[PDB]
Design a protein around this ligand. Sequence first.
Ligand SMILES: O=C(c1cc(=O)[nH]c2ccccc12)N1CCN(c2ccc(Cl)c(Cl)c2)C[C@@H]1CN1CCOCC1
Ligand SMILES: O=C(c1cc(=O)[nH]c2ccccc12)N1CCN(c2ccc(Cl)c(Cl)c2)C[C@@H]1CN1CCOCC1
Lengths: 300, 300
Amino acid sequence: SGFRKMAFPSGKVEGCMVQVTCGTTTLNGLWLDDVVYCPRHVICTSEDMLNPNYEDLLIRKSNHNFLVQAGNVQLRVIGHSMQNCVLKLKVDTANPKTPKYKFVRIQPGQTFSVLACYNGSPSGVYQCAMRPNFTIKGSFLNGSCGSVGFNIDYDCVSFCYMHHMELPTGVHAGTDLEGNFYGPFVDRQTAQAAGTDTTITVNVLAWLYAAVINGDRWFLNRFTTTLNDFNLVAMKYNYEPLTQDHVDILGPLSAQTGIAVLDMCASLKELLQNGMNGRTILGSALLEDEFTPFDVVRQC
Amino acid sequence: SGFRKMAFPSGKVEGCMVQVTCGTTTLNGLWLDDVVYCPRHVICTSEDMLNPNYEDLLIRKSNHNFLVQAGNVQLRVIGHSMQNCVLKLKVDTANPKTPKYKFVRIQPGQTFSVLACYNGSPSGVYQCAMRPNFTIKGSFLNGSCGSVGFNIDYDCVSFCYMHHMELPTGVHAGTDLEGNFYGPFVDRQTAQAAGTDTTITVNVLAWLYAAVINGDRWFLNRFTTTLNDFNLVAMKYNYEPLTQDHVDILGPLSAQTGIAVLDMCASLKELLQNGMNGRTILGSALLEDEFTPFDVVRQC
Ligand SMILES: O=C(c1cc(=O)[nH]c2ccccc12)N1CCN(c2ccc(Cl)c(Cl)c2)C[C@@H]1CN1CCOCC1
Ligand SMILES: O=C(c1cc(=O)[nH]c2ccccc12)N1CCN(c2ccc(Cl)c(Cl)c2)C[C@@H]1CN1CCOCC1
C-alpha cells in the first residue's frame, strides 16, 4: 500500500545525456544513435533575443562551432540541422547506451518523468503532468534547458518533452522531440505568459479511487449524480468537463473498488462544495490532479 | 524555480538489482561486487512465521537452494551467510556495474530515494523520509521486499535502507544494509505496529524557506519569538523540539532570504495556531515535513 508521486527509473535516459556548448552558452543534449538533440536557442546571443532569425544564426555556424561532451569523451560533430525548435547535431559515434526509444507527443492531462540535468549531468528525477494550458509545473534552474521528459513502456523509452524556458509565473514550457512547442509559446523574448489553467477532472477521480484502494473512505457517500449535473458543477469550479470516454477509462478502478464512477463524481461534487473540513486524502489537503488512471493502476 | 519531491537519478542502483529465489519465495536483492544482499525472511516458509529461528533455517540450506538471476543471466551462489536481518549470498561473478558505494544508516527526519523493484526489475523511483517513529511512508506491493533506499553524493551511492515489511497502517519498515532494523520492528509475525509519530520541525521550516525562495511570502510576519517560546507551541502541536543546531543548520537558508530563523519560527507558530485560511504554500495546503534543509538548498 501507500501512494507516492512515482517516476520511472531513469537509468536508460541518464545514459543518453550529454553537454552541448556553442559560444559561451552551454546546455543539455539528448544523444540517441549518432544524433544529439538540443534546444536551438543554444545558438542565440544575448543580443539577438527579441526577434532571432534562427535560420540566419544557423547558416553562420559550422560543425566546429558545437562542442559536445559525453562525460569525459568529446564527440566530434559531423553534421548540423534544425527541425522546428530543436537542433540535430550528427556526431561521428553512435551512443552505445541508446535504449529502444520513440518520440511521442503527449496530451494535456498526461504525466511523465523529468530527468533534471545540468552540464550534461543528471541531478534529479520527478513526475510532472502536462497542464491543460500546455505548461508544466517543473523544477528547473539555470542550465536545465535540454532536460527531457519521458515514459517507459516495457524496455522502450517514449521521449515526450524537451525543456526550453521558464515563464514569468515560474512554470515551464518546452517542445516535443520533433521541436514543436507544447502550447502557444516561442523561443524568443516576449511578454509571453501561461494562459488560464483548469483542473484535470478525470485525474482527480482516478486519485480518489487510489485513496479508496489505500483505505481513505471518509469522503464517500450514498448519493449519486448524472454526468450532465456533475459537469455543471465542474464548470463552476474550473474543472474540465467529464466525458463518457473518461467514465469508460475509469471503469477498471470503479470495478476494483465497487464504487460507480458517477458515485465517485457525487463525492467529488461534495468535496468541491464543502471542502475537507480539516481532513486529508492520501496525505494531501487539496484535490490532486497529476495522477492519471494509468498511474493509479500502475502503482496501486 | 519550482519545487518538487525530487529523487536521485536511479541508474547506478538499477544496475545492481537482481532476483533472489529460495523455495517458492522470490524477492529483490542488491548485487555489489561479488555479494548479493537480500532480506533473510526469504528463507522463511508460511509454516513458521510466529517464531522463526533463522539460525536453524539457514544451517539447513545449501548454496544450491538460492537461485539468483541478474536479468537473463543466472548467478552461481558460492557461499551464504547471515548478517543480522540480511542474507549475504556470495556469487562467482563481481557485478561489473558496481558503483562506488557506502553503507550508511540515516537519522529520523532524513530523506532518501527509493527504487521500488519487483522480480529484480525496477519499476519506479520516489523520495521518502525516515519518520521519527522509524517507519517510512512508502509505496510498495507484493514482491517489493529487497528494494533499497539511497542517497547519491558526487559519484558515490550511500545505501541506507532495505525494504522488509508493511505494517498494519500501510507504512513500511526495514533495515539498514547491515541488517539492523530501523525502529522496534522484527522480521517475524507479531501484532507490531508503528508507534506514535511527530512532525519534523526543522524540515517544515526548511520548506518555508524554500517557499520564500520561490516567492510565497503571505505567511511571513513582523513578529519574532524565543527558541523556548516556540518549543512550547511545538509540543502542543506534536512537533519535535527545535535545537540551536537546527537553527545553525538553517543559517544558510536564513542568510539567502534575509529572514532570521526565529522570525520564521514565529510564522510557523501562527500557521499552527491559525491554519492557512484557504491558501497554499508551494502547492500544498498542509505543512510539508519531508524536505530537509539539504534537499531545499540542493533544489533551490
Ligand atoms: O537556463 C535557463 C533557465 C531555465 C529554467 O527553466 N529556469 C531558470 C531559472 C533561473 C535561471 C535560468 C533558468 N535559462 C537560460 C536560457 N533561456 C533562454 C534563452 C534563450 C531563449 Cl530564445 C529562450 Cl526561449 C530561453 C531560458 C532561461 C532564462 N530565463 C530568463 C527569464 O527568466 C527565467 C529564466
Ligand atoms: O511482498 C510483500 C509485501 C511488502 C509490502 O511492503 N507491501 C505488501 C502489500 C501487500 C502484499 C504484500 C506486500 N510481503 C511478502 C513478504 N512479507 C514478509 C514475509 C515474511 C516475514 Cl518474516 C516478513 Cl517480516 C515479511 C511481507 C509482505 C506481506 N505482508 C503481509 C501482511 O500485510 C502486509 C504485507
